[PDB]
Amino acid sequence: MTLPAFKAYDIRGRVPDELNEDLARRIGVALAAQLDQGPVVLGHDVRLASPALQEALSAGLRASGRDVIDIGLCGTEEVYFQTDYLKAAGGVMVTASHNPMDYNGMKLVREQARPISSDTGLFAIRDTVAADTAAPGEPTASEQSRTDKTAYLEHLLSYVDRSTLKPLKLVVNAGNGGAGLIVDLLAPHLPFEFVRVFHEPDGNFPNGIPNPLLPENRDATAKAVKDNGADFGIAWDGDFDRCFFFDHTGRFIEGYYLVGLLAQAILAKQPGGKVVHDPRLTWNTVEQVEEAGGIPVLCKSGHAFIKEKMRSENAVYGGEMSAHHYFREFAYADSGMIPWLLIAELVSQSGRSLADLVEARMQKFPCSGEINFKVADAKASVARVMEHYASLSPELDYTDGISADFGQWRFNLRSSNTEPLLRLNVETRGDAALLETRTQEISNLLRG
Ligand SMILES: O=P(O)(O)OC[C@H]1O[C@H](O)[C@@H](O)[C@@H](O)[C@@H]1O
Ligand SMILES: [Ca+2]
């Protein structure tokens, strides 16, 4: 038995049996022993238990001599940004994404907001916490409240030339998470008219836990766009490190296509740079990056792998189709805010709608959408897929599960690192029929 809340990438579990104030305090103590010198930034999301868990983390950190910088209710990217900006030793964001109401969690970073993951400190914290029967000591360091968002907001706005922006009408859907607070702080500096949907932070989640991928939640943004004639819409998850785009027809744009589009937007500002992308869906990104004079860099999926590869490559931008977009000067971190500012600037400057910006790309590299499978035997199921296709001799790559490139179509098939699932992505060279027949064929094999 090990504490189940400790996952590969972060901590998450049901309160109070898998995560509670006692464990939170012990995590703070253990984190203090894992970090280089300096204070620790703490922030939390809108969930009802988040402040108390953060307080417990603070008590454990301060009992271990760490000054705490409490940045308050915020998004995950604000913990990243402030940890790096203030040159802190590390940071913790108290958040659970789209987990049930009785769940919470923590995302931990060290210096420069470098992720702490299972094999880079998180399981060391787990093992310390698991064995810690010490009496809780008393605080020896202090907590300061630092809710000034000025440097954060200036950083976000530095990505666009405000004088080129047009008064676009934008639907924004925080899903009752925290994104609306940042939208409202940016709004005085922008010419846009916002149509605010599910805007107020509310950890009771009266309109559902924030997950723009669920069709009922997707449709709320789509309807607001259509009914208001908005140029485009943006929705976020609760901690707003993920962003989801809807064109002026209400159509949700698959996150794959935002990677190539945002890469081109960044490459116009930082020419010739490297762009990091995941292996799930690739061909459109590679082509668009190259077309814009950048250099694409294939990387395993998962935010910590993306960030590490961006650092080693001095990459200007990285993007995953799972709705995460990473920016070198933003501490190599992901932001749910930078992407829509860039897209709004692109629409403003080009005179093209978001739909037009992506339409030809979606026709040229149609994709299945990510299809998930919980099967009895994942390894045997993957083996059945590969055995079926062996006679076509695809080019195989093992960066992240199995990528198989057949020429006019390819797939990526991999185990998720956040759920016990297999994830399938298929794309083709402009061939919707081949896309469907191969996707259904693989699905049948996986379910066999
Ligand atoms: O497909 P997976 O392995 O479940 O990860 C899905 C996503 O989970 C989180 O949102 C982040 O860690 C992302 O970096 C990752 O892409
Ligand atoms: Ca998130």
Name the residue ranges covered by the structural domains of the chain. 1-147, 169-246, 247-365, 366-448
Tell me the C-alpha distance between 340 and 346, whole Å. 10
- Within 6 A (CB) of ligand 1 lie 9, 301-303, 320, 322, 324, 416-419, 423
| SS3 state of residue 47 | coil
Residue type, 15: V
- Ligand closest to Cα of 237 equals 2
Residue 251, CA distances (Å) to 111, 123, 163, 225, 429 in order: 40, 41, 29, 9, 22
- Ligand closest to Cα of 417 equals 1
Residue 37's Cβ-count burial label (10 Å; 0-12, 13-18, 19+) is exposed
Method underlying the structure: X-ray
| SS3 state of residue 86 | coil
Instruction: Ligand 1, residue 301: give the atom nearest the CA.
Output: 16
Give the contacts of 29 (CB within 8 A, at least 6 positions apart): 60, 61, 63, 64, 128, 132, 134, 136
Instruction: Ligand 1, residue 370: give the atom nearest the CA.
Output: 1
Residue written as tokens 């919707």? 432
Residue 4 token pair: 């189940």
Resolution in A: 1.4
To the nearest 10 degrees (0 to 180), the angle between helices 338-350 and 354-364 is 100
Residue 165, CA distances (Å) to 132, 346, 350, 400 in order: 55, 9, 10, 39
Residue nearest to atom 1 of ligand 1 (CA): 416
Spell out the long-range contacts of 388-394 with Cβ–Cβ below 8 A and sequence spacing 24 or more: 388/441, 388/445
Distance 237 CA to ligand 2 centre (A): 5
Residue written as tokens 């440097």? 151
CB 57 within 8 A of CB 69: no
Distance 439 CA to ligand 1 centre (A): 22
The topology under which CATH files domain 169-246 is Alpha-D-Glucose-1,6-Bisphosphate; Chain A, domain 3 (3.40.120)
Q: Which of 9, 12, 240 for mutating ligand 1's site (highest number of atoms within 8 Å of CB)? A: 9
Instruction: Ligand 1, residue 423: give the atom nearest the CA.
Output: 1
Residue written as tokens 């501490």? 331
CATH 3.30.310.50 fits 366-448, yes or no: yes
Distance 105 CA to ligand 2 centre (A): 11
Residue nearest to atom 15 of ligand 1 (CA): 302
Instruction: Ligand 1, residue 302: give the atom nearest the CA.
Output: 14
Tell me the C-alpha distance between 395 and 402, whole Å. 10
Q: Which of 322, 370, 372 for mutating ligand 1's site (highest number of atoms within 8 Å of CB)? A: 322
Active-site entry in 58, 97, 368, 381: 97
Q: Is 97 a known active-site residue?
A: yes
Within this chain, domains 1-147 and 169-246 share the same CATH topology: yes
- CATH number corresponding to 1-147: 3.40.120.10
Interstrand relation of 295-298 and 274-277 (parallel, antiparallel or unpaired): parallel
- CATH number corresponding to 247-365: 3.40.120.10
**Sheet holding 395-397: strands in order across?**
371-373, 422-428, 409-415, 402-405, 395-397
Distance 320 CA to ligand 1 centre (A): 9
- Ligand closest to Cα of 299 equals 1
